[PDB]
Swiss-Prot record, chain C:
<keyword id="KW-0832">Ubl conjugation</keyword>
<comment type="function">
    <text>Adapter protein implicated in the regulation of a large spectrum of both general and specialized signaling pathways. Binds to a large number of partners, usually by recognition of a phosphoserine or phosphothreonine motif. Binding generally results in the modulation of the activity of the binding partner. Promotes cytosolic retention of GBP1 GTPase by binding to phosphorylated GBP1, thereby inhibiting the innate immune response. Also acts as a TP53/p53-regulated inhibitor of G2/M progression.</text>
</comment>
<dbReference type="GO" id="GO:0050815">
    <property type="term" value="F:phosphoserine residue binding"/>
</dbReference>
<dbReference type="GO" id="GO:0010482">
    <property type="term" value="P:regulation of epidermal cell division"/>
</dbReference>
<dbReference type="InterPro" id="IPR036815">
    <property type="entry name" value="14-3-3_dom_sf"/>
</dbReference>
<dbReference type="GO" id="GO:0010839">
    <property type="term" value="P:negative regulation of keratinocyte proliferation"/>
</dbReference>
<dbReference type="GO" id="GO:0005829">
    <property type="term" value="C:cytosol"/>
</dbReference>
<dbReference type="GO" id="GO:0005615">
    <property type="term" value="C:extracellular space"/>
</dbReference>
<dbReference type="GO" id="GO:0006469">
    <property type="term" value="P:negative regulation of protein kinase activity"/>
</dbReference>
<dbReference type="GO" id="GO:0045606">
    <property type="term" value="P:positive regulation of epidermal cell differentiation"/>
</dbReference>
<dbReference type="GO" id="GO:0031424">
    <property type="term" value="P:keratinization"/>
</dbReference>
<dbReference type="GO" id="GO:0030307">
    <property type="term" value="P:positive regulation of cell growth"/>
</dbReference>
<dbReference type="GO" id="GO:0046827">
    <property type="term" value="P:positive regulation of protein export from nucleus"/>
</dbReference>
<feature type="site" description="Interaction with phosphoserine on interacting protein">
    <location>
        <position position="58"/>
    </location>
</feature>
<comment type="similarity">
    <text>Belongs to the 14-3-3 family.</text>
</comment>
<dbReference type="GO" id="GO:0045824">
    <property type="term" value="P:negative regulation of innate immune response"/>
</dbReference>
<dbReference type="InterPro" id="IPR000308">
    <property type="entry name" value="14-3-3"/>
</dbReference>
Length: 9, 231, 235, 7
């Protein structure tokens, strides 16, 4: 599964 | 026009009007008055600079992708303009980091307020590290690790594992391990531990609290699914 | 330090991809200031840049002015010089951008010398940016501004009616904006409804002949005319 | 619900 990682928000 | 209360008022107005550089400038001026920020005021400062750097990072990623993809028609203008955006991004991080060191990070106050400012210090060094290339890269990466680790120590000593500030800090530090520190094992581990520990406490939660906590927990779960490749 | 024309156009395309429209505007301003004619591609880069810049300023001004209008209502708290001060800050900034665009148009772009499509494009642009000034104008200067927008749009209308077919997207867009000017600025809802109805009907009577590519640009603007007509006439 | 101009 390819998407972008997630930081705060 | 200049009084602290007027600056806080104008930053709230700038937020409603989606004018984030103005919001940042008003909040910077409010911080520079020398007083403590309330929980509300802390968030106005965060939102303000997060939107400003958000746009700069997104732009830098587009330009850098065009610059690195062009291999074997290239362009001196891509590099020059990527450098322009990058210098501007760096200026914002240096302004935020300056405010944190000169006015916000203090000897002690409430744990929550202390974690928030060290998480911020961590994040803005992480943003510098995303664009850092020289011999500077190591010291920047180290500075983000110290800031994040110091906030981890406070959160683990003073906050329960379900606390949203603690959860958010651990999520960002795990992103630091993965992306910046090139430690996918530490990243997966921190995210797995953080999620599992908060899952074991989630029952003793208020509706308001629960919503903030489960939001971060899904960000953790999603990172994990992507990092481990489990589905 | 690559500040030749081709490099400025290149950097404006890069600024667009990076959604840095204030940068894109300044690269396009510098390109215009070289003294050469803009191509159809280059005219669009200039319009996109400044449309995004003023778009944000107008949206902000509307938010602030709406809050200011609530604070001047009968029986409210009615205190706080902050809203007015900050609305004035945004307004002055907005005015500076319009004056920059209008200056480029008068000093470099609008020429008697030019092609029909390009002249209409620039004159429409002159009407739009005077319309944006009129949105915030309250003083004695409001009439001068409203007149300046009418002259630009009327001069553009005359060229489009003489040189362009009723299905032309530049002509359709001009007529849409001039009808918005009539409704919102000139306080002439009858003229607005009429212009929009006429523009839509004349273009509809010619849709049959339109090529595959032209049909998409034209029908897009025609839907905007239809939406305004639905809103203005209530149907 | 707001009047459409260009774009």
């Amino acid at each position: 599964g390819s998407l972008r990682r997630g930081s705060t928000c | 026009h200049m009084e602290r209360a007027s600056l806080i008022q104008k930053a709230k107005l700038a937020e409603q009007a989606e004018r984030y550089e103005d919001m940042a400038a008003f909040m910077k001026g409010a911080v520079e008055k020398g007083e403590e920020l309330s929980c509300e005021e802390r968030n106005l400062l965060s939102v303000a600079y997060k939107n400003v750097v958000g746009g700069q990072r997104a732009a830098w990623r587009v330009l850098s992708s065009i610059e690195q993809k062009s291999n074997e028609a290239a362009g001196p203008e891509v590099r020059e303009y990527r450098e322009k955006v990058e210098t501007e991004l760096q200026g914002v991080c240096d302004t935020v980091l300056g405010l944190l060191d000169s006015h916000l990070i203090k000897e002690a106050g409430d744990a929550e307020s202390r974690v928030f400012y060290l998480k911020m210090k961590g994040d803005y060094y992480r943003y510098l590290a995303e664009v850092a290339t020289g011999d500077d890269k190591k010291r920047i990466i180290d500075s983000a690790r110290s800031a994040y680790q110091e906030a981890m120590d406070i959160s683990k000593k003073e906050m329960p594992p379900t606390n949203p500030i603690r959860l958010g800090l651990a999520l960002n530090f795990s992103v630091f391990h993965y992306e910046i520190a090139n430690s996918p094992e530490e990243a997966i581990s921190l995210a797995k531990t953080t999620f599992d520990e908060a899952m074991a406490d989630l029952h003793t939660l208020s509706e308001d609290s629960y919503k903030d906590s489960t939001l971060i927990m899904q960000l953790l779960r999603d990172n994990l699914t992507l990092w481990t490749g489990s589905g």
